[PDB]
Amino acid sequence: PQASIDLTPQTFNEKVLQGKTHWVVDFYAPWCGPCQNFAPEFELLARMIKGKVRAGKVDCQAYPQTCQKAGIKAYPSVKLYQYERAKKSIWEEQINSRDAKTIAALIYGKLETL
Numbered sequence: 001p002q003a004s005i006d007l008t009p010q011t012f013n014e015k016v017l018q019g020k021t022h023w024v025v026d027f028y029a030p031w032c033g034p035c036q037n038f039a040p041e042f043e044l045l046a047r048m049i050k051g052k053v054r055a056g057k058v059d060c061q062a063y064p065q066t067c068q069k070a071g072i073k074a075y076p077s078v079k080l081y082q083y084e085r086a087k088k089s090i091w092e093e094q095i096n097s098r099d100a101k102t103i104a105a106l107i108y109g110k111l112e113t114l
Contacts, residue, residue: 003046004055009066012058016081017090022053024095024107027070027077029061035076038098042078045100053080053107080107 007015007025016023026042028035046055060067060075070079071094078095093110097103 003043003050004057007056007058009063012056012063012066015054016056019081019090020083020085022083022107022111023081024049024053024055024103025070025079025081026055026057027060027067027072027075027079028057029075030059031061032075034098038076041098041100042076045103048100048104049107052111078103080110082110 004026005011012025016025024045026035026038028038042055042057049055058066058070060072070092076098078097079092080095081090081092083090095103095106097106
């Protein structure tokens with residue numbers, strides 16, 4: 001059962017960027033061998049970090065301006081959007097890994113640090 005949610009320009013803006021919670025987002029395209037290989041890894045990642053971090057996916061073929069605005073130039077790309085409560089703001093970082101265990105460790109470290 002799918003642990004990540006499929007985001008649209010509207011829900012990515014509303015739930016992630018204007019949100020009060022942490023997200024990892026997989027920016028992908030459907031015609032993409034690498035994206036296809038990574039999809040079940042991203043689901044594993046979503047299941048690993050559930051309840052600390054939400055997981056979303058953005059189809060960059062369907063929504064090219066959203067992906068362009070997020071600085072995405074190749075697929076797949078994973079970004080962490082973390083909420084800093086005291087500053088009421090979302091901080092983003094691209095995580096250059098295709099491995100769920102690796103990405104989870106990196107996310108958890110980033111969440112520990114101011």
